[PDB]
């Protein structure tokens, strides 16, 4: 019954008066810490404070919250970051003088591993978010590509993925594959495919290797 | 703080409202509320507090201070729910579940009752665009009672003795986010050239029927 | 012809390109049209044309004698000029996005405003309506080639225009840009424009009313 069009737009109705580029900052570059701080924290409700706000989150992190009910509504910490992420695009399609100041203070840590930075594009940088998937038209299907690829180039879980197959785009279109023409998802595929992600490195040791 | 109203808007506020009591809310919580407003106006203007909570028919809500002659002038947050908005966000849910399958409106029918637009005799007959519309806070949402919010505030304004003053309020107004509201689309559109019915409708506040006794008129 | 288009650029970025600021790239995008005159009237094969500052000298082939005229490599007509120019931009805002903003202010395309793209549907877009855009699709992402290919589709032009932006070699093997990946990121560019409404722009809203749009 959930709608992920509706919990944005419910999100920015509380929060979304508060909201700046500095906290959206701060969240992402602490996410894991909260994910963990939720994990070993016990209150199915918890308050969380990323410079200045303010969140109260649903905790589904405690391990014996990981398969409860969540309420539509109810703001979880990947829902936060899908809000967070959709929100930072749409200051960016808007007033190009906010993208400029966007690209100076946050940094998306899931986009500079993989090595993306904002000089490919917010739509692509942003959609490593976790999240970002509830909002497949906004981020040019970049998050149902940027997860194909950890499945291609690295191996994470095919089941992983299987949460953003189902995300649906638009109206009456159900995502799939067809529904929504492919060629749209083949050249955000072959757009990501420009970057590679590999550590490193720069220097050969002459002692071995 | 002063003009104008920066953020804004009020279908956010909405649909994030309807996120925090959507769940438990009926049409015996709008019954009691409507009717309850009058007297929960004035607890909000005896008491301190600068963000209360109240409870009608079962919830449940903390509501913003805005009649405390304190707090009148003061600033409010968007999600802060004011009763002047909660008269209007309610007076949308009712108007959205009768604008979604008929079986719904009888239960509307029955028990809900608004008593601004009692005091002109209107009933659900009027279809429940126009009655809803009487309720305060509905100009906060025009289409979803096509205009009629901006004209019963037009129009007790001229057949009544109000000011232009509660009309600032009305107008800044967007028709789904619209360039030229004014007065001003193409054909006149809704304001008065498809109304004509709060003229239609009468002065009324008779109170009682014949009752023709010993008195004037009527 | 005997020129790479990309030759031509890096040369032209020698030049003048230690001068060029988006102030000098504003003047050139407003007299774009409207310098196709001063080279068709005086008889010169080349005039040194100033556009706020600099400074260039533009090789004429506008005068109606100078068509039977081959034109050399090294030279830079109106149509080079513009797309070299078009191409400088882009890649000046490729680097950084704190420069990016900075064109959103400064400049401003005739060509595409009219079709009614704007800087928010994507500089490679709004830049890629510019004339000799197209010797460089590698850049603007196969915009040129696309807008070229719906303002004869839905609207009407001559085919035979579209003949000229169909050489253009991506980068090898070679002409084509026509299949690769797939078929060359085209359908998406071309589809995009499809997305932004040929809605011819101007006026201020608006109600009419009696008669039209």
Known sequence: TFNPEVGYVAFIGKYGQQLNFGVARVFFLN???????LHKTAQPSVDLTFGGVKFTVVNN????????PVPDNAITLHRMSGYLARWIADTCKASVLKLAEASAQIVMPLAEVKGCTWADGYTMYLGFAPGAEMFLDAFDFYPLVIEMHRV???????????KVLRQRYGTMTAEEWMTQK???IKAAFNSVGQLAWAKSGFSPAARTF
Do not use: C
């Open 182 to 184: 492919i060629t749209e």
């Open 61 to 68: 992190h405690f391990p014996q919250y990981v398969s409860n």
């Open 31 to 37: 996410q894991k810490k909260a994910k963990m701080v």
């Open 152 to 162: 291609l180039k690295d191996n994470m879980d095919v089941n992983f993925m299987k």
